[PDB]
Structures are given as structure tokens and as C-alpha cells.
């Protein structure tokens with residue numbers, strides 16, 4: 001059924017699974033028209049499909065042309081997400097297909113279930129975890145590829161860089177979610193923490209800086225402090 | 238007019254005949270029901286006084302044979318049987334009528350209720366949902382499960398309603414996922430009407446039969462089927478006008494006949510609120526919407 005804190009280690013077992021987050025598929029800016037009405041302008045979005053055990057991220061870029069002439073875009077976005085995830089599954093070899101797909105928003109359950117009727121043994125599940133995947137577009141290299149896209153495109157990343165050479169998947173996912181929560185809560189300060197030391201760089205083939213084990217400990221502490229600081233600012237604590 | 242005699246009434250029982258109900262005491266000199274209108278299916282149903290468990294009954298049409306009821310003390314129920322000896326049957330009936338040991342199907346002349354509830358219900362279609370080919374009448378009870386309930390356990394004793402499942406490959410064309418899930422017109426018009434039922438009369442017949450089994454036996458799977466068949470229509474953007482107008486009449490008479498005190502167990506709040514206020518057909522069921530709002534405004 002639903003995925004939560006009680007069954008959290010299930011994310012790192014040997015059954016292939018993917019998280020699907022649709023929060024950046026349909027992105028708009030709102031503006032006034034010449035007549036003083038309000039209009040939206042869509043911008044390129046993305047589906048965030050992540051294997052939490054291996055770090056493989058299937059980033060499907062959603063180009064604004066897919067909305068052209070369509071109505072009820074927020075509804076369509078869910079069905080387009082389900083269509084694209086179904087297509088990804090069918091494109092994978094049998095032994096790489098997921099056994100479970102966990103959607104971060106419950107409104108994706110029926111669209112995905114309907115698109116995956118041909119795969120009755122792939123479980124489609126919600127989660128009670130509040131995951132910060134909406135902040136994926138705060139990772140500079142992900143935002144850049146989405147914004148530069150001129151057509152639909154799929155780009156593959158490892159969202160954990162080389163961390164699994166040194167840490168477990170559980171720990172990698174915990175680091176990722178802490179980083180993304182910090183970027184969601186205070187993006188400018190989080191980015192400052194990550195780049196405050198010019199001598200630590202991001203390799204061409206990586207998304208995050210090349211921190212040593214001890215430096216990651218310091219960074220993680222600074223991220224927790226940022227989150228707590230913002231909590232006190234928000235609630236006057 | 239036709240007659241269903243009873244050999245006797247050895248156990249105290251509430252007997253119902255279509256929408257009417259009456260009590261018979263243990264060993265009361267009761268020998269059946271006369272004046273049953275020819276031209277419709279009928280249902281004779283039972284609930285034992287000493288054990289309200291298992292309501293059960295029999296759907297029948299007096300044009301198909303001469304039927305009577307006889308209590309079986311081994312299986313502990315009133316059983317319908319066919320009498321093939323016509324002159325014997327007529328003589329039995331005539332004597333019981335002369336001794337005035339029968340009740341009369343009390344149809345008020347102005348009252349079209351039973352026709353309105355069974356307009357599309359045919360005995361031949363009942364006998365395909367309830368499979369027991371050696372009898373011309375069909376036994377139903379409160380506990381019988383439907384073929385769909387079983388898929389989710391004795392198949393010979395099942396209700397073979399047409400399976401409706403909105404999240405099934407039958408309901409959703411590959412490549413038309415969003416279209417077919419948000420607008421069930423394909424599933425209604427091509428799959429169900431043209432494909433399985435052949436016409437709207439057979440579809441309404443099954444819908445009406447499901448409602449009646451839900452109401453008269455408290456059969457849960459029948460209630461599920463009745464609501465699914467309503468929702469399939471209401472959730473379709475493209476429905477022939479004659480079907481929508483007929484559905485409004487069908488549902489109106491069903492809601493009118495439902496006992497007020499059973500509304501909590503016979504009406505699905507989700508389905509009705511969706512059908513009357515959110516669905517494509519939210520404005521096509523004026524008569525049903527009016528009676529629902531006046532009779533069961535709490536449900537809404």
C-alpha cells in the first residue's frame with residue numbers, strides 16, 4: 001500500500017522501484033495582459049523519476065509545445081506524466097522494469113494505474129513521506145538542461161554522483177533529501193553553503209561538489225542549521 | 238390471472254410478492270397467492286420469522302409453467318416447483334380458491350409500480366444471470382455472490398452479472414487512456430451496448446434486476462452492480478437521448494419504491510452525489526434528482 005516511515009528500508013532493498021514526482025511537469029508564470037486581465041505563460045518542465053537504490057534519475061523534459069492548444073493543463077499534466085512513465089517502463093528491458101512505482105502526489109495514482117494496465121504486477125503506490133523533489137530544479141545542471149531544451153528529451157543522471165562508492169543507498173537518499181529540503185526552504189543560502197569554498201568544485205560529470213567524507217558532515221550540519229533557522233523565522237520561534 | 242399455490246405453511250414466515258409483503262403464522266391454513274398479473278416477471282420471497290438470516294426467493298413468469306411452493310423440512314426452506322400435470326394443478330388451485338385459502342395479489346388499478354420497476358426485465362435474461370437450466374424459475378438469496386465479487390466461491394451458485402470495471406483493459410483503449418477514463422462513452426456504447434448487451438433494453442433489464450435483488454434480498458453484490466450500471470451511463474458524455482430519458486424514469490420509480498428506512502444500506506452516497514451533481518449527465522435526470530432531493534436530502 002502506501003509507503004511511509006515504518007517501511008522505509010524497503011526503498012533500499014533489491015526489488016527495483018522508482019519514485020515519480022510530477023510537481024515540475026507543468027510550470028507557468030502568471031502575468032497581467034494589456035487589457036489588465038491575467039494570463040499564464042508555460043515554461044519547460046520535467047518528470048522526476050528516480051531509483052532510490054541506485055540514484056538513476058530519468059529526467060524527461062516536458063517542452064512547452066506539448067501544451068499547445070490543449071485545455072485543462074493541470075489535469076493533462078498528470079496524464080502526460082503517466083504516459084511518459086509507462087513509455088519509460090516499456091523501453092526498459094524486462095529485468096530492469098520496476099516492481100513498484102511510488103508517486104509523490106496521490107493525484108497521480110489513477111492516471112498511472114490506467115496507463116500501466118498492461119503491467120498488472122507493477123504495484124502503483126502513494127507515500128506518506130513529504131519528499132522535496134520539487135526542488136530538483138534548484139540543481140543548476142538539471143535546471144539548465146530543462147530550460148535549454150527545444151524539443152522533448154530524456155536525460156539520464158545519477159543524482160548521487162559517486163557517493164555510493166563510500167556510503168549506502170539509505171545514507172545517500174538521506175543526504176539527497178536533506179540537500180533538496182534545504183534548497184526548497186532557502187535556495188540562496190543552501191547554494192551559498194555548497195559553494196562557499198572555491199577549492200571544492202563540481203566535476204564535469206557530477207551534479208554536486210566533490211566533498212570529502214568529513215566535509216560532507218560539515219555541509220550536512222550546515223544544511224540542518226539552515227532548515228532549523230528558517231523554521232524559527234517562519235513561526236517566530 | 239395466474240396462481241402460485243402453496244402445499245402448506247409449516248413455519249412462520251414473512252412472504253413477499255414483488256413490492257408487497259404479508260406474514261403467515263406457523264401452520265396457518267395458507268395455500269398461496271392468486272390474481273397474479275399476467276405479462277410481467279414476478280418474485281416470491283421469504284424471510285423466516287425464527288431466523289431472519291437468509292432472505293431467499295424465486296423469480297418466475299406464470300406464462301412459462303404452473304408453479305407452486307412446498308416447504309422442505311430437510312433443507313429448511315420453501316421451494317418452488319413446477320407441476321407438469323395441468324389438470325391436477327387446476328384442480329388443486331380451484332379447491333384452494335373455493336375454500337378462500339389464498340391471498341390476492343393486491344394490485345391497485347391506477348398503480349403501475351411493478352411494470353415501472355420491471356419494464357425491461359425478461360425471464361430469459363434472468364435465467365442467464367442465475368444459472369440453473371433444469372428449472373424455469375430462478376432462485377436468489379441474500380448471500381449469493383456475483384462473478385465479479387468472486388474474482389476479487391462456488392461458481393454454480395453465483396450471480397453472473399456483466400462485469401463492469403472502470404480500471405480494466407476492457408474499459409480503456411490503449412492510446413486513449415485519459416479520454417476513456419474521464420469519458421466512459423466508448424465503454425458504454427461500443428463495449429457494453431453494441432458488444433455485450435446488444436441494445437439498451439437488455440442493459441436496463443439487468444440494471445432493474447440488480448436493483449430488485451438488492452432491495453428484496455439485501456444482496457450486496459446486486460447493489461454494487463446497480464450502482465455501477467448507473468455510474469457508467471452518468472459518466473459518459475455521449476448517451477442517446479432516449480436512454481437518458483428512460484434512465485430518469487427507471488431510477489425515479491426505484492427511488493420512489495425504496496423503503497425510507499433502508500436508504501442507508503441501499504444508496505451509495507459517492508455514486509449518487511457524483512451522478513447527480515458532478516457527472517456529464519448531472520442535468521439529464523430531473524425527475525430522479527427531484528425525488529432524491531426531497532426524499533433523501535441527508536444522503537446529499
Ligand SMILES: O=C(O)[C@@]1(NCc2ccccc2)CCOC1
Nearest residue numbers: 254257258259260340341342343
Ligand atoms: O400487513 C400486511 O399484510 C401488509 N401487506 C398487505 C398484503 C396482504 C396479503 C397479500 C399481499 C399484501 C399491509 C401493508 O403492508 C403490509
